[PDB]
């Protein structure tokens, strides 16, 4: 019943910006943190940061602070992640993952992921 639906594949030009979405459903949105994670081939997983849908407080990996902007929209139960000044290093699969943070910290449900390809117009 808990579901995290992320937006479709994206193709964007270098230097541009993009906004990815993560639609949450089947639970109380504001009760869980939402993380964003970056996956590139041979590069395992990279943590981008998390957002608390309750107050929209964020925590970032230093390496992504100037790269990513996390927000939420309570009404639509959607978490967004904007990525700016795109380069080919940003090409990857991006996931949103929910976390329970009371008494412990654990991920449970993950989105299916969104593929981003940063591609120059020929």
């Amino acid at each position: 019943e808990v579901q995290l639906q992320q937006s479709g594949a994206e193709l964007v030009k270098p230097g541009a910006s993009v906004k990815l979405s993560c639609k949450a459903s089947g639970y109380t949105f504001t009760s869980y943190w939402m993380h964003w994670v970056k996956q590139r081939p041979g590069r395992g997983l990279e943590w981008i940061g998390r957002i608390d849908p309750n107050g929209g407080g964020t925590k970032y990996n230093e390496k992504f602070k100037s790269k990513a902007t996390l927000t939420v929209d309570k009404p639509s139960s959607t978490a967004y992640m904007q990525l700016s000044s795109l380069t080919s290093e940003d090409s990857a699969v991006y996931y949103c993952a929910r976390m329970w943070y009371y008494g412990t910290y654990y991920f449970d449900y993950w989105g299916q992921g969104t593929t981003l390809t940063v591609s120059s117009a020929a």
Binding site: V37, Q39, G44, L45, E46, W47, K59, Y60, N61, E62, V93, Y95, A97, M99, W100, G103, T104, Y105, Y106, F107, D108, Y109, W110, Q112, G113
Partner: protein, 108 residues
């Protein structure tokens, strides 16, 4: 910090296998709140354990977490064929999270 996991491990059905998660900074502690997540083909991720030893809801009990010596460990007691996957551990370092490189588990 660099988080290290076994590159790949092989087990047979019904056996017990232990995956480890090492921290380059020193011993892993409960304050690293070790997480373990499972990736299955088709980019299908599932959180298993968080805070060293707490299982997310619906996760089979055969998956358990602990600290063994200097490392965080994920033990799978009675490996199942469906357990064949890539397991990532992640350690919390007082403000950010680091993922290990993942362990590919093969079940014979």
């Amino acid at each position: 910090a660099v988080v290290t996991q076994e590159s790949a491990l092989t087990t047979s059905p019904g056996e017990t296998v232990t995956l480890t998660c090492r921290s380059s900074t020193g011993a892993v502690t409960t304050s690293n709140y070790a997480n373990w997540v499972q990736e299955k083909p088709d980019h299908l991720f599932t959180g298993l354990i968080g805070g060293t030893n707490n299982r997310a809801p619906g996760v089979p009990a055969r998956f358990s977490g602990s600290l063994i010596g200097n490392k965080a460990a994920l033990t799978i007691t009675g490996a199942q064929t469906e357990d064949e996957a890539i397991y990532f551990c992640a350690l919390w370092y007082s403000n950010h999270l680091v993922f290990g490189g993942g362990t590919k588990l093969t079940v014979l």
